[PDB]
Design a protein around this ligand. Structure first.
Ligand code: MG
Ligand code: MG
Ligand code: MG
Ligand code: MG
Ligand code: MG
Ligand code: MG
Ligand code: MG
Ligand code: MG
Ligand code: MG
Ligand code: MG
Ligand code: MG
Ligand code: MG
Ligand code: MG
Ligand code: MG
Ligand code: MG
Ligand code: MG
Ligand code: MG
Ligand code: MG
Ligand code: MG
Ligand code: MG
Ligand code: MG
Ligand code: MG
Ligand code: MG
Ligand code: MG
Ligand code: MG
Ligand code: MG
Lengths: 157, 199, 131, 135, 81, 88
RNA sequence: CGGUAUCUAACCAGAAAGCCACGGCUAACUACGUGCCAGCAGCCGCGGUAAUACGUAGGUGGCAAGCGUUGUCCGGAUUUAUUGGGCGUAAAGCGCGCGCAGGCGGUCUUUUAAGUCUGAUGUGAAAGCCCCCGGCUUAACCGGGGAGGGUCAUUGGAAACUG
């Protein structure tokens, strides 16, 4: 489909060999479409553009779905992967998207228009992206809850 | 006006043809300065919001203090913040004087309004920031009706918007209703403005 | 339990969900029965039954899962613990998950869900959040 | 901590420390006691001038001046710019701002405000160092 | 139809004086920040006309004009021992 | 003595008065007892609003209007009916 | 106050733009001069003869009758964590026990109304923040009405929970 990539970070890692050092570039890339599908990927190569290529190819296997009632997440949720945490809150209409570095990319490539968020834990980009993905995975719509609990949509609320 | 200088440079730097018909970018559509043809640089995230903000205050030509003040007082009305911010920027007397066709650029309309040639609902007003409401009538003071520049300002009229009304026999116009972002502007994301000012 | 039995009830339900158990039994009480009835009538469990014994009685609950798991009840927490009791005014009753979840409040007409406590315009001690 | 442990003994927050201790003291001669008042600048007379050597790895000859302030506290300050005119028994005005290199210098002499003149032959960044607009 | 005076209930704690009794009154108060009910007892002075009360009793007192340097409360009745 | 009097506010060269009641001693803009009405002299028919029955009962108790307040009360008809119920 | 506000005629683009920054955070790059010297610096840190970091110049970016520096206060700081942190190895379980005060306390029935919830009355002055109208050629500003703010006093109700 129509995918928009966005490099989040590029890092230059190194390993020590008997003759000195060896350097490799690792790229983190978040891809997705503005309709509600988004994923992330990590690639590593001895050259940056090939690192982005590997990252986008890896990312193309980890789509998720973001329930986005009225261009807004249904409710607040905390993602707690690894050592990092992200807190997401629904926001008023036309308020924009306010977020840190990579969580902004994740929430903007998914098509969510209005949301608030705060990085309550660490600031490593990989862990922030993973925590945001977990928090999104903890999201459920009113229709689904009504179906689960028997009560219809209106009697639910 | 308040900022006096070349006008093609600002449009070239921002990347749109603000206040024009593309006349600022047919030849040399690249940024000014010694550089500009030499190289192009990737934009950071801060630069994106900065550009989308300078794209709007340079369009209507008002300084930063007024810009943030009108942003804050627009934030009080019911509805969407960016929309209401960009609608009551179209209610400045300069905007209506330009839209009717009594000037060729917003600078010309501002300079016309300063010198007192335009009377709002019968009373002469000498300031360019008077927010006009719906149902008020605008004239040309009846003492400077037959001037050259204002007469040729109708020779290149860009056709009145749908939310105004104007006639040339009485040289009189009025604001009909309020615009709704489906009539004004097409190259500006106001959500970027709200992000920049809500950091 | 030693200090607070309502927290024990909530944590027993939570522990049963984590391993996908099917039912659980526990000691009975006049408030635990009514909490279980609220949970059933709201739609968070499957059934509740009462087994009689010598001293106090026992209550068993049959939990509810979707077609492929998908825990119907995904989280419990206690708000007013014995070390600190919290009370809510009629205009301060919390809304859990924008109304997706429920809050139990012990008002002057029994224990009520968050929704129905805003119909009589009454408040009181909040016991638990369930969502 | 349990809520009871906080009721019995609350949380005491940290306490910060000032970084320009001379500028927030004054002297009253009538009762001879150092009062507390926060001032953005402060004047004093310089008792010596000279140069120092910065810490490794930087290497230069940094021009300081040791001054005695109106409240009696004598400190060391740094003279910015290319060249100065300070001598003995010269009255100067000083303000906060530390140079990282010099271990002892903690304040910073403002230029062009008093017996000390500006910096000659400045063309840009001129408000600092106190130079008038040429031509 | 007449304005009234404040009335308190408490426990007698000392009686060694003449015609007076010290009364302790106990009350909750929630803390300023953590919102927890904490006990607090204030101890008063009362005017016992016939040395009726005894240590440990439960009594009711009311307010009155200053009858001494530190007494402004009057015994009303003894609730119980 | 207690009297009803004007109290100045507004802006420089744009005055606006509030008919209040106060002791003679207390400052011109200081503490009052209660507010009776308003008075704007920058219009052709001067703009006045008076609570009437409140100041009517509050002038029976021995509060004497100032000269200007007397003029305003006379124009508003208050003093004639005060006189009437004093002898009626 | 004061011939102050305001109004009407005629004349000239003529008298009227500076301050800081351009290695990264942070929006904006080239040339010459100097050679661990002169100097810069909020942190990381530049300068050792080809310096986008020092000095100047051309250009650019922010602001604008102002622009910077210093001093103090709050935020970012979840870095005193009630909301909102922890204690195997990163800072952090007293060497262990008996225990006064204190804190907390299994199941059910009846009563009470201290805590809890609710109605009414009185009060929380004026100015200030907020909401709605109005007047100054708009604004600042000035008026008019209202709301909000209490572990508040009196009096009447409910009894699930704690006592
Ligand atoms: Mg500099
Ligand atoms: Mg008059
Ligand atoms: Mg004159
Ligand atoms: Mg001319
Ligand atoms: Mg940049
Ligand atoms: Mg060179
Ligand atoms: Mg620099
Ligand atoms: Mg330089
Ligand atoms: Mg400029
Ligand atoms: Mg200004
Ligand atoms: Mg300043
Ligand atoms: Mg400062
Ligand atoms: Mg803090
Ligand atoms: Mg422990
Ligand atoms: Mg160790
Ligand atoms: Mg240790
Ligand atoms: Mg221990
Ligand atoms: Mg041990
Ligand atoms: Mg019990
Ligand atoms: Mg007890
Ligand atoms: Mg008030
Ligand atoms: Mg108006
Ligand atoms: Mg006002
Ligand atoms: Mg008001
Ligand atoms: Mg009972
Ligand atoms: Mg009862």
């Amino acid at each position: 489909l129509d995918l928009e990539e966005r490099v989040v970070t590029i890092n230059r890692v190194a390993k020590v060999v008997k003759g000195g050092r060896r350097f490799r570039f690792t790229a983190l890339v978040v891809v997705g479409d503005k309709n509600g599908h988004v994923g992330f990927g990590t690639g590593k190569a001895q050259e940056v553009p090939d690192a982005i290529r590997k990252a986008v190819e890896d990312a193309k296997k980890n789509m998720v779905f973001v329930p986005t009632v009225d261009t807004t997440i249904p409710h607040t949720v905390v993602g707690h992967f690894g050592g990092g945490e992200i807190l997401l809150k629904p926001a008023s209409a036309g308020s924009g998207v306010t977020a840190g570095g990579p969580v902004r990319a994740v929430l903007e490539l998914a098509g969510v228009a209005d949301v608030s968020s705060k990085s309550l834990g660490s600031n490593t980009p990989i862990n922030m992206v993973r925590a945001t993905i977990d928090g999104i995975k903890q999201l459920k719509n009113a229709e689904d809850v009504a179906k689960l609990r028997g009560k219809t949509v209106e009697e639910l609320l | 006006a308040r900022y006096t200088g070349p006008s093609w440079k600002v449009s070239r730097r921002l990347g749109i043809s603000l206040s024009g018909t593309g006349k600022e970018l047919e030849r040399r559509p690249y940024a000014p300065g010694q550089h500009g043809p030499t190289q192009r640089k990737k934009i950071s995230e801060y630069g994106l919001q900065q550009a989308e903000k300078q794209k709007l205050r340079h369009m209507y030509g008002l300084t930063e203090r007024q810009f943030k003040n009108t942003f804050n007082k627009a934030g009080k009305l019911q509805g969407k913040h960016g929309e209401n911010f960009m609608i009551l920027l179209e209610q400045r007397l300069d905007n209506i004087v330009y839209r009717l066709g009594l000037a060729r650029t917003r600078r010309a309309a501002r300079q016309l309004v300063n010198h007192g040639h335009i009377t709002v609902d019968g009373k002469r007003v000498d300031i360019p920031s008077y927010q006009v409401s719906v149902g008020q009538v605008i004239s040309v003071r009846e003492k400077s009706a037959k001037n050259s520049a204002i007469a040729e300002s109708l020779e290149v009229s860009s056709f009145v918007p749908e939310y105004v009304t104007f006639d040339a026999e009485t040289l009189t116009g009025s604001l009909n209703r309020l615009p709704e972002r489906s009539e004004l502007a097409a190259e500006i994301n106001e959500a970027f403005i709200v992000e920049f000012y809500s950091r | 339990v030693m200090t607070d039995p309502i927290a024990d009830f909530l944590t027993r339900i939570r522990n049963a969900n984590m391993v996908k158990h099917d039912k659980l039994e526990l000691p009975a009480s006049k408030i635990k029965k009514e909490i279980a009835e609220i949970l059933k009538r709201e739609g968070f469990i499957r059934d509740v039954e009462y087994i009689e014994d010598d001293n106090a009685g026992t209550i068993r609950v049959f939990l509810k899962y979707g077609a492929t798991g998908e825990r119907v009840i995904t989280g419990l927490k206690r708000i007013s613990k014995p070390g600190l009791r919290v009370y809510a005014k009629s205009t301060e009753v919390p809304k859990v998950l924008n109304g997706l979840g429920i809050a139990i409040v012990s008002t002057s007409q029994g224990v009520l869900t968050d929704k129905e406590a805003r119909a009589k315009q009454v408040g009181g001690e909040v016991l638990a959040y369930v969502w | 901590p349990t809520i009871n442990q906080l009721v019995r003994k609350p949380r005491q927050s940290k306490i910060k420390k000032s970084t320009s201790p001379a500028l927030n003291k004054g002297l009253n001669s009538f009762k001879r006691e150092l009062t507390d008042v926060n001032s953005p600048q402060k004047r004093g007379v310089c008792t010596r001038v000279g140069t120092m050597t910065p810490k490794k790895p930087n290497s230069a000859l940094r021009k300081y001046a040791r001054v005695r302030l109106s409240n009696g506290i004598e400190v060391t300050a740094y003279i910015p710019g290319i060249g100065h005119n300070l001598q003995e028994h010269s009255v100067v005005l000083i303000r906060g701002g530390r140079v990282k290199d010099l271990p002892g210098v903690r304040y910073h002499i403002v230029r062009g405000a008093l017996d000390t003149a500006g910096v000659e032959n400045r063309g840009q960044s001129r408000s600092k160092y106190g130079t008038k607009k040429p031509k | 139809d007449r304005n009234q005076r404040k009335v308190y209930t408490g426990r007698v704690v000392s009686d060694k004086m003449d015609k007076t009794i010290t009364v302790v009154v106990e009350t909750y108060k929630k803390h300023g920040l953590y919102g927890k009910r904490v006990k607090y007892s204030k101890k008063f002075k009362a005017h016992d006309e016939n040395n009726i009360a005894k240590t440990g009793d439960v009594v009711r007192i009311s307010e009155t004009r200053p009858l001494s340097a530190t007494k402004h409360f009057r015994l009303l009745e003894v609730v119980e021992e | 003595a207690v009297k009803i009097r004007l109290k100045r506010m507004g802006s420089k060269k744009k005055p606006f008065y509030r008919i209040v009641v106060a002791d003679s001693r207390f400052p011109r803009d200081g503490r009052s007892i209660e507010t009776i009405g308003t008075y704007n002299p920058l219009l052709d028919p001067v703009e006045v609003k008076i609570d009437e029955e409140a100041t009517l009962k509050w002038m029976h108790n021995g509060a004497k209007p100032s000269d200007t307040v007397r003029n305003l009360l006379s124009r508003e008809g208050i003093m004639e009916k005060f006189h009437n119920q004093k002898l009626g």
